[PDB]
Amino acid sequence: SVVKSLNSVNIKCLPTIDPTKLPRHEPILVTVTARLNKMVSDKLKGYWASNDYRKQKEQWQNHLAQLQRGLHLLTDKEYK
């Protein structure tokens, strides 16, 4: 209900997530980015080569890549 009021300054709310309703060994941070990557991709599809569509897109792709190179260690069991 709280997110319903917020959707109705502008504030964006991400849909509720539940670790129990998820695979046991998949961390929260990969899931929160999955939902977070959901919207930003959707908004980029809406622009579809409008003004500065590339600017936001490429700055997003690099940021996702930099996060990915830090995502393997979080799930990694030990040091190698």
């Binding site: 500065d52 590339r54 600017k55 490429e58 700055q59």
Partner: protein, 255 residues
Amino acid sequence: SEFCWLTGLLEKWRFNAPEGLERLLWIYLLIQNQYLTLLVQRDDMTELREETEKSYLSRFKHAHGAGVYSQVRYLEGRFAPKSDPNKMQKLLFSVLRGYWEYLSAHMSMEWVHEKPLTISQVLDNLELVEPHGKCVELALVPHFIKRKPKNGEAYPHALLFKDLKNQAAILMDMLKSEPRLTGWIRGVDAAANEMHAPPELFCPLFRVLAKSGIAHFTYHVGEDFPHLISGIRSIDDALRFLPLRNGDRLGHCTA
């Protein structure tokens, strides 16, 4: 410094560029390109005395190219003889020191002197090297200049002849004072233009340099003949009158 600057600048404008500062880049490129065309056209003092020695090392390195083995083997440079003997002993010294600095960086052979301080010690250092197929072999060739015809003096190009005989004489005593220099000063050239001096004028000049151990002479026919038939004659004049043994070269035979 310039190239690394521009890579950084355009990277911050990779997505968008403010109109104000973008125009600054536009005019600077237009100013740079305009000067480059101007510099080329004037060719076809502090100009050479900036540092006068680091350039020659950079020039040979630029000729050598990247990699352990160079791209050019045989290379001779053109340089106008200076007016004063105290200057020729410096201009020639900086070239040889620059060339030796090129050789020292690549070839880790023993050198007689780490710092030569003079032409003579460079010759001692350069006598220990052999041409092994990747180092740029150098044999300098000073080139003369032809001036505009000045009236009087019993023939139109006489102050020119008096000017060149002075410059040539300075070259003469360098070879006899430094007999080892005959291996690096191997040629003589006359490269200004065609009409400003007849080709037959250099005939007595080249002959006296032949008796002084130059051993090679090249002429540079000016390619601005007033008529195609005149251009053919000019090359014919160079052939007939100039002293040219077998194995010499002409320059810019566009006629």
